Design a protein around this ligand. Structure first.
Ligand code: HEC
Length: 108
């Protein structure tokens, strides 16, 4: 919850190895198990058009920014209990800073 800009090149590799299994970043991109993440920053949770969220994700109603995204990705089910995101998180703050630096641009 204290994000500092990092390495987008590392962040992209992190996205492929840790996220791309369940997510896409491009505009008009397909949903997988998880939603497409285009426009995720500056948007309240649960609002990927065409995806069906849990009540936990919708009720959380979090306005995604770099800080709360970092806290979320540390341990998703702690931040949003009841969510179906079967993913334990990124514990290393440096990974989260890199990943989020990539996401902010990749979903822009
Ligand atoms: C499955 C194997 C997943 C992996 C690996 C990651 N994510 Fe995920 N994510 C997944 C699901 C099924 C969902 C929906 C959860 C629900 O309650 O409906 C999500 C959700 C997110 C969100 C929230 C989207 C929104 O509120 O609009 C974000 C921001 C997100 N996921 C990001 C994310 C990142 C950055 C990941 C790796 C670094 C990642 N997810 C992995 C399924 C899976």
């Amino acid at each position: 919850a204290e994000f500092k800009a990092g390495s987008a090149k590392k962040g992209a590799t992190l996205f492929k190895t840790r996220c791309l299994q369940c997510h896409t970043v491009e505009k008009g991109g397909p949903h997988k198990v998880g939603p497409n993440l285009h426009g995720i920053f500056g948007r309240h949770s649960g609002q990927a058009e065409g995806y069906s969220y849990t009540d936990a994700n919708i009720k959380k109603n979090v306005l995604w920014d770099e800080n709360n995204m970092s806290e979320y990705l540390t341990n998703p089910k702690k931040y949003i209990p009841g969510t179906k995101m079967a993913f334990g998180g990124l514990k290393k703050e440096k990974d989260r800073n890199d990943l989020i630096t990539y996401l902010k641009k990749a979903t822009e």
